[PDB]
Design a protein around this nucleic acid. Structure first.
Lengths: 49, 36, 241, 785
RNA sequence: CUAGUAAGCGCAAGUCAUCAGCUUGCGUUGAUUACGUCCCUGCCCUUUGUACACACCGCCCGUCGCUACUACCGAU
RNA sequence: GGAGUAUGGUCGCAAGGCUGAAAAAUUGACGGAAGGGCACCACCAGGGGUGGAGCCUGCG
């Protein structure tokens, strides 16, 4: 809630940018957050063709 | 027996008690003892 | 969208301009306002469109006439800016590949991603071959911290309070905290004035935050000294033996 | 319980996969076989049909400096290197996730880059038979590969990228289309220029040249635009002359020559085609002054054109051994020696034992095709409402009659005696034609989708748009009964050879097994994942299997069932396109199946952990100090020959490694492990503490572990002799380290105090009045008591 | 099967239900051997949420799915 | 006569066969590696049955 716009903070407390983040740790971060949540009449032409 | 077991776990509803919050009376709402 | 009457539309190539004195343009397929131009005073009477290009001429109850030549130019400027962005990001990545530390820090300062910036900070505080007169270990990096600009310093104070908040990155935060104070004078630091210091991001707050984290680390390292005296004790012991 | 196998497969030339190759031979791609044809002659030399794979191949490529070995790439991510000398694949390369699309050879032919729909580009060795390494950029899948060593690539975010080979990372990228995607990459054969054709018909043109500084190799020398504002499929160069070809999938291709970028690059010719090209390809024929442009066209054809080098003409074509648009009907002759096939515009009759087309005829559209008994004439019905009558012997049309007006005649069935035919249109009537004259029409409320006779000429059955079926008698057309119970309109029906049974398959993805006496549904069967188009019994129960039947469905699959036990006895896979027709042998020995493949197939510890980690680190330190002695004696070639695990972990420092194996675990088990560490391991550990003391990393960790090993071994330490020197050295190093860092952060905190004071003195107050009342953070700390 | 725990011994009562081919009480004599450990087999649960200090740590991983967007493919 | 409370008698509806036995979902599905706790259905130390002969209830 106190973070800046283009970046996100970690559980360590490190603000890291979505822009600099690659898809790999993107999916991994989304996976960890999802795991936190988890622990919480027509035509005859159309018919015959 | 087996099918009624199957039935209740399917439409899973349990007569068993839940852990009541330990001091429901004076603290019915229950904010954390933390920073606000 | 009007508080007053519109009194004329002209067609593009939707343009409302009337007694409310704020003109408003849009295209009807979306129907949402594309500009609002307020060179004009209380009441606005008429309107005109350029024959071929798109320049507007606002004129009303006054005798002021103002022309407004030309979404698409915004897309064009964003396109060239994004070409610049991807070029500088790729050469930043190649600076990482080469280990081009100083200019890598420079380009990371412009592009504002503190994570890769901090990885550069780890490398530059631990080069394994630091320059003797240097502050971080690399004198050109000492030069770039000598020639920082104000808003960049302030945002580094933000990244710095964060790297100070976490403890494994506290010492690398302390060294870049340490070289920062040596370079630039205190009157400059106090007369620092950037627009984005409001509430939790204001200067008093972020500063005293850094202060209390450093005070914790200060007491910690003091205890480390006091317990470190034991090896001198045992050295005296084996000297007796 | 006899089973069916993929026995014959034919009736098609090159599908909608790209990247065909010329060698006077044309290696084109079918679905599963990679097949080579002659262009002057209509006869194919061979096909490359691998039994181990089923997937549709979609990338073909010829090795430079090595013809007759070819690398192909399938739908599953596989790369099969085949031989043309022997119709077999020498090697298979399955590293990708899905759908090989773009390939690039080495100029020598030992190195292979493959890029897929799964966005990966994998480089492979061709003498060690391993994927060399994996290259990962590319926010979306790739479009173009080339071997410059270096790699020049482009991908679907309009991104062009140059990578290095010696350094497996990207070196440069740029963007082709401002607000679109690139679609085609063309490299000049001398490595001097590259052209990138994107969505808007826009071809960005770039020049080339053959690390810490501002490297710039590629230059955007400009843009160009073509005539057709379509996505461009391929831009192929001339290997020898100064020409190249741009095509997006249309009836228009453009050849452009090489002499501002508009001044240099002008269209040579714009060629118009009869169909939409899938892929263009080049050919130099031996002994000609011409440019042989081979177009492989999506409407099942090949066409070789001549371009004069300082116009176009249809020089050659392959369209005879296949149809052209889409097969829509079948009729396998009574002798089971030939068949009829009806497609939109083309009808071809084919001999089975040579599995080859014999004759070809033209029409507008074709719904249904069926010979008459004696196999002399064929009856075809078409979308324009019309019936045409051809023959097989004289190869001509006989008659042409508007049966219904423009209503698509959904049904043509012969009378099983062989004297009448029946024709069911999209209108509200359907007509019996005795041969030919119109015997009798029938009127009903809605459109019919299927009708049949009974194998004993006793009953007839119509089957309508209303998801209903009305069965009548054959002699007078009075309603025997009617079947319902499908929610969607029926697509087909088939009754048993003894007329004791019905199967009624509808677009509800299920079939109904009825009885023909009282017409009771013996079984509803929900067994296809899609709308089953057709179903057919065998008439010959002479094998004892007459109540077996095949059900062919839109999701490219047929199932062989037994109605008696109501069970699917077999699944028949094999097609990769929506099946439209099929036909059963009259003896029932084989079947044919024609599909939207446009093809036809015929079927018959932690303490010891950090301890030995320390030990390996000691070995590495000994190697490094002996290597330093060697390079100090002479700067000659002396390799460190470090641990394989260390050079695999990335030439990392051994002290960094043991710092990691020290940094991972918890404080408690750390304390525990160092308590375990024996006194033989203590000097190695202490020397590593010395290394961390000089190379200061994780200061409180090093200090804490130092103190702990002192307190668990102190008397041994003060009793020993050799440790005294090591303790002196680490002591000097640690005092240096601690003093440096403490003075650093003390400088920090003093500066913090003074900047606090001056910022206060800045911010204090400006106005002075009677109100000093205006001159604090707050926190909450809830407590449940 | 780890402290009045195991075994041995008896004397009684016969508790609506079950138990005399026994069951249940209650007294008597009363030990070895552990009483550590998560290494085997395991089982449970941490990697979310749940109160703040001085203190420590420092963004597990996978295959997919689902939702939004992009563009494609070809029939009718 | 009013109010309930019952007991069963009476009537209306429920009581008209496109039929013929065998999902939801931003939260979802399954795993794996590190970290602890536990256990006489685990280790370690020991003991003691039953299982040998016979009697015999009960269970098949």
């Amino acid at each position: 809630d106190t973070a800046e716009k283009g970046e996100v903070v970690t559980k360590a407390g490190i603000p890291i940018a979505k822009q600099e983040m690659s898809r790999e740790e993107k999916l991994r971060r989304r996976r960890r957050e999802k795991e936190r949540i988890r622990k919480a009449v027509q035509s005859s032409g159309a018919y015959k063709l | 027996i087996e099918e009624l077991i199957k039935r209740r776990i399917l439409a899973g509803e349990f007569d068993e008690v839940l852990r009541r919050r330990p001091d429901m009376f004076g603290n019915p709402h229950g904010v954390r003892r933390g920073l606000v | 969208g009007h508080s007053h009457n519109v009194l004329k539309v002209v067609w593009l190539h939707f343009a409302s301009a009337g007694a409310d004195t704020l003109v408003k343009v849009w295209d009807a397929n979306t129907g949402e306002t594309e500009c609002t131009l307020d060179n004009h005073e209380d009441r606005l009477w008429t309107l005109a469109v350029h024959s071929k290009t798109n320049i507007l001429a606002s004129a009303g109850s006054d005798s002021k006439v103002t022309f407004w030549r030309d979404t698409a130019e915004t897309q064009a400027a964003a396109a060239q800016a994004a070409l610049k962005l991807v070029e500088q990001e790729q050469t930043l990545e190649n600076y990482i590949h080469a280990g081009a530390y100083r200019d890598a820090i420079v380009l990371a300062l412009q592009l504002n991603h503190p994570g890769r910036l901090l990885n550069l900070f780890t490398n530059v505080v631990t080069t394994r071959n630091p320059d003797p007169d240097s502050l971080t270990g690399l004198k050109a990096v000492d030069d770039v911290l000598a020639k920082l600009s104000d808003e960049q310093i302030f945002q580094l104070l933000l990244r710095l309070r964060d790297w100070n908040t976490n403890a494994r990155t506290a010492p690398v935060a302390q060294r870049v905290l340490w070289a920062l104070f040596k370079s630039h004078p205190a009157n400059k630091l106090s007369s620092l004035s950037v627009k984005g210091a409001r509430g939790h991001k204001s200067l008093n707050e972020v500063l005293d935050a850094i202060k209390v984290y450093t005070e914790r680390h200060y007491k910690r390292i003091e205890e480390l000294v006091d317990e470190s005296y034991l090896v001198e004790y045992t050295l005296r012991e084996m000297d007796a033996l | 319980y006899l089973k069916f196998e993929p026995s014959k497969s034919f009736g098609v030339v090159v599908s909608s996969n790209s990247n065909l190759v010329w060698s006077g031979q044309a290696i084109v791609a079918a679905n599963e076989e990679v097949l080579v044809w002659d262009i002057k002659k209509g006869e194919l030399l061979s096909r490359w049909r691998d039994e181990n794979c089923k997937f549709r191949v979609t990338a073909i490529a010829q090795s430079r400096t090595d013809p007759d070995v070819f690398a192909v790439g399938y739908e599953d991510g596989s790369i099969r290197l085949w031989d043309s000398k022997i119709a077999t694949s020498v090697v298979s390369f399955n590293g990708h996730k899905s759908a090989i699309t773009v390939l690039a050879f080495d100029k020598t032919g030992v190195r292979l880059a493959s890029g897929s729909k799964d966005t990966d580009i994998i480089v492979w060795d061709l003498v060690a038979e391993v994927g060399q390494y994996k290259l990962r950029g590319h926010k979306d899948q790739v479009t173009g590969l080339y071997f410059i060593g270096f790699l020049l690539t482009t991908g679907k975010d309009s991104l062009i990228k140059l990578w290095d080979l010696s350094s497996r990372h990207c070196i440069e990228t740029h963007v082709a289309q401002a607000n679109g995607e690139c679609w085609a990459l063309g490299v000049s054969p001398d490595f001097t220029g590259c052209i990138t054709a994107g969505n808007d018909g826009e071809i960005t043109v770039w020049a080339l040249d053959a690390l810490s500084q501002s490297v710039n190799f590629l230059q955007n020398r400009g843009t160009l635009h073509r005539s057709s504002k379509e996505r461009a499929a391929e831009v192929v160069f001339h290997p020898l002359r100064d020409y190249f070809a741009v095509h997006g999938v249309e009836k228009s291709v453009e050849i452009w020559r090489i002499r501002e970028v508009s001044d240099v690059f002008v269209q040579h010719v714009i060629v118009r085609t009869t169909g939409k090209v899938r892929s263009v390809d080049w050919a130099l024929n031996p002994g000609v002054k011409d440019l042989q442009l081979l177009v492989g066209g999506t409407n099942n054809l090949l066409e070789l054109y001549n371009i004069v080098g300082k116009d176009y003409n249809k020089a050659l074509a392959v369209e005879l051994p296949g149809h052209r648009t889409d097969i829509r009907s079948v009729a396998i002759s009574s002798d089971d020696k030939m068949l009829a096939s009806a497609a939109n515009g083309s009808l071809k009759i084919w001999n089975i034992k040579t599995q080859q087309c014999i004759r070809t005829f033209d029409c507008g559209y074709a719904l249904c095709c069926a010979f008459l008994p004696g196999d002399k004439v064929v009856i075809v019905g078409t979308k324009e409402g019309e019936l045409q009558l051809y023959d097989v012997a004289s190869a001509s049309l006989l008659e042409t009659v508007n049966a219904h007006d423009g209503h698509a005649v959904w049904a043509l069935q012969v009378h099983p005696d062989g004297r009448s035919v029946v024709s069911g249109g999209a209108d509200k009537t359907a007509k019996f034609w005795d041969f030919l004259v119109q015997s009798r029409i029938l009127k009903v409320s809605d459109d019919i989708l299927s009708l049949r006779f009974s194998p004993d000429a006793r009953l007839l059955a119509v089957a309508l748009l209303d998801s209903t079926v009305k069965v009548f008698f054959n002699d007078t057309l009075k309603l025997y009964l009617n079947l319902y119970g499908h929610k969607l309109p029926v697509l087909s029906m088939d009754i048993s050879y003894d007329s004791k049974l019905i199967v009624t398959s509808s677009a509800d993805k299920n079939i109904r097994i009825w009885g023909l006496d009282f017409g009771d549904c013996h079984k509803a069967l929900f067994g296809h994942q899609d709308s089953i188009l057709q179903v057919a019994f065998i008439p010959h129960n002479s094998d004892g299997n007459g109540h077996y039947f095949f059900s062919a469905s839109k999701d490219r699959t047929i199932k062989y069932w037994d109605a008696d036990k109501f069970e699917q006895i077999q699944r028949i896979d094999g097609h990769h396109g929506e099946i439209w027709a099929l036909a059963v042998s009259h003896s029932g020995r084989f079947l044919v199946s024609a599909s939207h493949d446009k093809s036809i197939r015929v079927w018959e510890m932690a303490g010891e952990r950090i301890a030995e980690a320390l030990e390996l680190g000691m070995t590495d330190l000994n190697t490094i100090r002996e290597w330093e002695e060697a390079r100090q004696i002479n700067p000659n070639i002396a390799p460190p020959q470090r641990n394989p695990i260390f050079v695999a972990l990335g030439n990392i420092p051994a002290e960094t490694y043991v710092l990691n194996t020290l940094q991972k675990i918890k404080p408690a088990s750390l304390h525990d492990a160092l308590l375990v560490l024996p006194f033989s391991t203590i000097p190695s550990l202490l020397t590593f503490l010395n290394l961390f003391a000089q190379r200061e990393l994780n200061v409180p960790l090093t200090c804490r572990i130092l103190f702990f090993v002192l307190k668990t071994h102190h008397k041994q330490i003060v009793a020993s002799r050799t440790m005294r020197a090591t303790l002196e050295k680490v002591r000097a190093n640690l005092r240096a380290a601690l003093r440096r860092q403490k003075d650093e952060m003390g400088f920090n905190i003093a500066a913090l105090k003074v900047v606090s004071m001056q910022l206060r003195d800045k911010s204090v107050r400006e106005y002075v009045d009677e109100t000093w009342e205006e001159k604090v953070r707050k926190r909450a700390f809830a407590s449940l008591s």
